[PDB]
Symmetry: C2
Subunit: 144 residues, 2 copies
């Protein structure tokens, strides 16, 4: 569909990540009934851990809850197209679908049982783009 | 992935439909192991039946094989983006994924558990576009 309520929630969460120095990305994992089982934000720089993107964080939350590395029954929704580290972690726990809102400007993948699917929600996409733009502006100001 | 072998097969089949007066569309339904369970071509005008597009034909083949209207365990691959009649029939048998090669130039859908996903296979897409173009050229020649 367009996940308007889940996206409202994720966009609200990611603000937290932006306040603390990380690209404001939030994401959740859902079961087939679209219930959220785990939610996480990006905390790579905040916790000085190369792996702590929102996607790997949410994967680890669910591994913890279910005591299992097999998430084949679940789908992932993120505000921003995942990097390749996260894409590979998502693949390695057998999640078959990644919904993302905003693709990443910054590989050639012929994987399957793994679809990367852009959510169409223009209002939410424009809102999240404005949040990211504010983050990057502050990024270049501190860069200089 | 890019379904290169299945697409080779479908593009070969659809030629049959083009020879007999129908837009040359072919499609199959696959299980989770990507095995084909049913394959069909468009035969609307050939059999004077508004419903006999390739997608509805393949659905009926599988309903027949399984004696069930519940195809929730299966995915559909077609050469051409489905019309809305077929999209609704696919939804009504609970198939969750439609892979298509070529989108249709000729609605606003907020359905979910139903993803419409364009296959990326440039060589196969260009080949199928050339086949369709030949079909339409002959169409306008007979039109006049
Ligand atoms: Cl890998
Ligand atoms: Cl309906
Ligand atoms: Zn990442
Ligand atoms: Zn149709």
């Amino acid at each position: 569909d367009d996940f308007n309520n889940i996206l409202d929630l994720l966009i609200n969460e990611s603000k937290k990540a932006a306040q603390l120095g990380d690209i404001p990305v939030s994401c959740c994992i859902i079961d087939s009934n679209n219930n959220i089982l785990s939610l996480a934000i990006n905390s790579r720089y905040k916790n000085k851990d190369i792996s702590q993107h929102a996607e790997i964080n949410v994967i680890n939350d669910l591994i913890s809850k279910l005591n299992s590395f097999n998430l084949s029954k679940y789908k992932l929704i993120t505000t921003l197209e995942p990097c390749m580290m996260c894409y590979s972690a998502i693949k390695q726990v057998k999640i078959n679908t990644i919904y993302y809102l905003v693709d990443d400007p910054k590989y050639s993948i012929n994987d399957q049982n793994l679809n990367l699917i852009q959510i169409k929600n223009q209002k939410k996409q424009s809102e999240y783009i404005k949040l990211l733009n504010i983050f990057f502006i502050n990024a270049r100001l501190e860069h200089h």
